[PDB]
Every structure is written in structure tokens, then in C-alpha cells.
Design a protein around this ligand. Structure first.
Ligand SMILES: C[Se][C@@H]1O[C@@H](C)[C@@H](O)[C@@H](O)[C@@H]1O
Ligand SMILES: C[Se][C@@H]1O[C@@H](C)[C@@H](O)[C@@H](O)[C@@H]1O
Ligand SMILES: [Ca+2]
Ligand SMILES: [Ca+2]
Lengths: 140, 140
């Protein structure tokens, strides 16, 4: 079960002002994100973000979540997966609606104190293939 | 418990790097939609400020309610907020003193039927200050 209200598309998801909530309205706050604009005539398929995550313990399963959204929404849709220690730990997720923030998730099992993580693009195209990543989180 | 969190606040990439297929990466301010509480003059802003009749629950289960909130502007009175469910206080009042610092209110409640009555609570009636935004509410 999960009931998530982020107010995208001005959907209040049945939340209402209470008696003490006066003159409520929605605004655009801001959150920092890496932008992937994929310029012309470069190959944008492969590992697009990399990190050697330290502080792990062998045999534990860690959960990697990435908050990601397509932008612009024109031409080719991005397709993004997660990789850990060379192993694909998620299916390729196609990003479709512009500025709809979704979670890309995978789990991996550490073999030691660190793991080599990579976010992977499966679309080499520059026409479209535009998206943003605002958060990468690993929990265990 | 392990957590490695990168949200790029203050442009901290937290040891994430562009991969070979990550061309011309940069940070941007992406939008994130939020309810603004500007608390106008000569109204009482203490009490239940946002509420929802949450459906689809199964009686007896323990649900955890999260709310991402931040003071803004930071002048005059500081907000103070908590969570309430079925008329019961499930979180301690927390003073949001740091402007633009996003914090997560969290509380647990067990359902009493098909639905639950949830309310975010303000403990500051003042209009002088007492300004904040809520960008996300989540129950799971
Ligand atoms: C018409 Se410019 C072409 O399409 C845009 C939607 C972007 O993907 C841009 O990077 C690309 O060069
Ligand atoms: C100087 Se106008 C006074 O203080 C501002 C910081 C806001 O809290 C506004 O709602 C209030 O009326
Ligand atoms: Ca592009
Ligand atoms: Ca105010």
C-alpha cells in the first residue's frame, strides 16, 4: 500500500484545507537535478552516471532508488536501467510523460566494502532522449 | 542501517560522476509542486490546516505517514507542525526554524476500518511569519 501526493498536475489527491488552513494554493518549489539534454552527434547509450559506493558489508542486500523524469517529451523516449558490479539490477525503464517523476529501483548484494554503481542509458539518440535525475539513494 | 543519499542540494554530487555515455551534464533547478502556507493577517492559523479522508486501508494494519515540509522566508514567527490521525496525535510538534530546510514529519497509526481521517496540525496561530510549504504527503 502507498498513497503518494506530490501535487504534480495540481492533483491534491483529495487533500483539503482544514479549518486552520487559510488561503491555500500551489506553487513551484525547486529541487536540484542533473539534466541530460543529449546533444547532437554524441552516443548517449551506456553508463551515464557512475559511483563507487563505500561503507557496505558483504552479503547484505541494498536497495538503490533513483528519482527520474523525462523532460520536453519530444522524439525518442529515454530508457534507463541500473547496474551494480557489472550486473544489471533493473529492467530498462522507458520514460514517457514529461515532468512525471517516477522511481527507478533495483537491489544488489554487496560482495565487500564497496560496489561499482552505474546508471545506464539504452538510447544513443540525441533527437529527444531528454531527462533529469534529482535523487539517487541507496539503503540497506 | 545504511543510507547514501544524493539529491544535489548545494550542488553536492556526493561522488557521483558522469559516465562515458554521460555527455555535457549539469545541474538545474527542477520544479517540485507544493502547497504554500503564507498565513495572511488577522486569521487564526493554529489547528488542522490540511486534511484527507484516506480510503483503501485494511483495518488493523500499521501505516506510516510522511510529510515533506519546509519553512520559507524565515522572518518573524517560526512554524510549528505535527501529524494527527483519527483525532489522535501521532507525531511530536516540530518547530521549523531554518528557511528552505526540507524536513520529514513522520508518524505511525493503525487503521480502525476502511478509511482513516488524517490532518496536518499547526501550533502557531500568528500571521507575522509562520510561512512554509508542503511538497509531499505519503502514507504506506
Ligand atoms: C530539435 Se533539437 C533535438 O531535439 C530536442 C528535443 C533535444 O533532444 C535536443 O537535444 C536535440 O538536439
Ligand atoms: C511583513 Se508582512 C507579514 O510577514 C511576512 C513575513 C509574511 O509572514 C506575511 O504573511 C505577514 O503578513
Ligand atoms: Ca537531446
Ligand atoms: Ca504569514
Amino acid at each position: 500500500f502507498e498513497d503518494l501526493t506530490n501535487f504534480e498536475r495540481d492533483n491534491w489527491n483529495n487533500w483539503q484545507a482544514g479549518p486552520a488552513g487559510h488561503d491555500l494554493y500551489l506553487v513551484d518549489a525547486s529541487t536540484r537535478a542533473v539534466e541530460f539534454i543529449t546533444r547532437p552527434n554524441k552516443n548517449h547509450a551506456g553508463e551515464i552516471l557512475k559511483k563507487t559506493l563505500t561503507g557496505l558489508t558483504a552479503g547484505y542486500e541494498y536497495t538503490w532508488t533513483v528519482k527520474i523524469a523525462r523532460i520536453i517529451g519530444k522524439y525518442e523516449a529515454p530508457k534507463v536501467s541500473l547496474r551494480a558490479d557489472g550486473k544489471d539490477i533493473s529492467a530498462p525503464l522507458e520514460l514517457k510523460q514529461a515532468n512525471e517523476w517516477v522511481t527507478l529501483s533495483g537491489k544488489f548484494k554487496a560482495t565487500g566494502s564497496q560496489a561499482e554503481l552505474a546508471v545506464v542509458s539504452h538510447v544513443s539518440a540525441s533527437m529527444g532522449n531528454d531527462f533529469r535525475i534529482k535523487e539517487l539513494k541507496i539503503k540497506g
